[PDB]
Automatic annotation (TrEMBL), chain A:
The keyword DNA-binding applies. The chain holds residues 5 to 189 of 272 of the full protein. Residues 45-115 form the OB domain. One of its GO terms (molecular function) is DNA binding. It comes from Pyrococcus abyssi (strain GE5 / Orsay). This is RPA32 subunit of the hetero-oligomeric complex involved in homologous recombination.
TrEMBL record, chain B:
Residues 81-109 form a coiled coil. InterPro entries: NA-bd_OB-fold. Keywords: Coiled coil. This is RPA14 subunit of the hetero-oligomeric complex involved in homologous recombination. It comes from Pyrococcus abyssi (strain GE5 / Orsay).
From TrEMBL, chain C:
Zn(2+) binds at C217, E219, C220, C235, E237, H238. Signal peptide: none annotated. It comes from the Archaea. One of its GO terms (molecular function) is DNA binding. Coiled coil: none annotated. The keyword Cytoplasm does not apply. The sequence shown here is derived from an EMBL/GenBank/DDBJ third party annotation (TPA) entry. NCBIfam families: PRK08402.1. This is Replication factor A. It comes from Pyrococcus abyssi (strain GE5 / Orsay).
Amino acid sequence: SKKRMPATRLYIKDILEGYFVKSEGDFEPNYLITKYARKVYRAKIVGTVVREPLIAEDETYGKFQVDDGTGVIWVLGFRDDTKFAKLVRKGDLVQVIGKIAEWRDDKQILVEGVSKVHPNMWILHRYETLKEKIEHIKKAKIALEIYNQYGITAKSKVIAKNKGIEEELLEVIDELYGIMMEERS
Amino acid sequence: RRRKPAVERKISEIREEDTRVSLIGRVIKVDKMDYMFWLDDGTGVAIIESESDLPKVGQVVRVIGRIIRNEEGIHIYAEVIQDFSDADLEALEEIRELERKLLPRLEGEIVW
Amino acid sequence: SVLTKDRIIEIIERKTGMSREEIEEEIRKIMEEDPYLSEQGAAALLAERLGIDLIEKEEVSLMRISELYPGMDPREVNVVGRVLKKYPPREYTRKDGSVGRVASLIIYDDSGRARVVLWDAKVSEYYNKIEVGDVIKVLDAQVKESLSGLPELHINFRARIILNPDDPRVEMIPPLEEVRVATYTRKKIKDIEAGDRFVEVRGTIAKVYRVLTYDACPECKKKVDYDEGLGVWICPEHGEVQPIKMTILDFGLDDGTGYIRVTLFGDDAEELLGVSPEEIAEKIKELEESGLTTKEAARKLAEDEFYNIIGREIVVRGNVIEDRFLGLILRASSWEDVDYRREIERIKEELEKLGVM
Ligand SMILES: [Zn+2]
């Protein structure tokens, strides 16, 4: 019953280029679906802090800019989560994990943890991020062919099971198609 | 208009269109009077004008900064200088080649 | 129901090693003395003279050591295991002045290992007779669980032990010669199940639950229990000992494929936090005085002082146990820094499977 979704290791560019879906239901969290149909709940980025953190006088909010090469994202913490902005400085190589949030139609990360990492960890991060992107795109390429031929039907769910494809992946492609059709109009 | 990302490039691969670059190399000479240090990554040598933080000669560092293109020449105004002495440069070069060949291919695979 | 004529012959063949023709001659000799006996009854009388007729004392079961769970009904406990280790017996002075005894025996089967804790008279009754290699039968013991994820069979006044029993599971236990030290196996959190042992998981800290200290043995670094009826802290391996402080670190790990609660112990937890356990105990005391409970103080200290460890990639190694209220807990005995060069090679192998290299 109590399930925690795992953080997906992604590039900053993929998070910025994705589509934020704010869940209206109380028992549903906010998720971002990237251009390659990847339903991501928590973000896991590794980059360099380009500017000195902005800490308020009354310690109500703390924000800092993170740059991994692909993009620059904002990392925010409020009230007690301001302690995360104090740990970092301008020039630190850190790993940030948190929930994806959208403020004024701009993507940003609500910090849950941030810590300094070794330069070899940044190399490792690029290896894992590239690897997971290859794995997901190859699975979604086959699932795209099943969705373009049958759609979301009882017959298509059996064919996807035989090809090593999860049922949720087909529903994410349909959700992405609906978002893209709204943008065309 | 969002702040431009540090385009990770080599010293030989510096395109005129680049504004902010990520150069990873070894320091070969340090001038404390003019606050500038020479960086060598294996493809070329560039002058790095630092604000106040001056690294040691021989220390491998990662420098993120703005390209200063003027009548004086082409140098890098340092903003961030990280310690890459304990970094596996062979692994860094291997993932650079993997990203150069796979990332542009993966970008256009799922586009509708 | 009583055993059949052929079943008695089969048990006499196994317990005496005599041939079926030899047993049939001895049954005929008994029926010659008393012709009023049946072919089944003569075999029963033959077994009684041999000393095998105590066949009605059959307590056979198929319970493995892995199936033992803390807080179980002692009556349900019926496991068998060969003695691998024998620890020296220790003594403790009770409240009434009497000196009690306690001895630990590490046993094992084809599934896992367990710690047998002998208490008072059970030490002089069994320990002297028990040798390394003998298979014992643990019955009616109280099952507890150590912090490392190892089950404990506490042999009290209700518990019984059978030296070398006639049980079918005894043949399935591998010999002492074949027993090797199990190394840690790499496994993703997505594939982690309850009851897994010796698992190496590489992940990132996503949240810190509690930071608190526990009283432990100053020699083996194991949790000591406070006996209120005696007034002493008794280690289930070194008897009456003076307890020392050791750190417990509850946090969450995230490898991209799953999430799991991890718990750290003593010297390994102090290494990750950077604060000594004596200083952590003092910080907990200060929060308890302010009106917070033991669990509230541990949760507050973790979020207000040890929030910096969240986001660091670390490697943990331990057993996965299933708590009745906290779900899956990977009780990591040891932790180490990520070998980046080794972790890159694991990725390269998976890239070759996809068709990248
Ligand atoms: Zn002890």
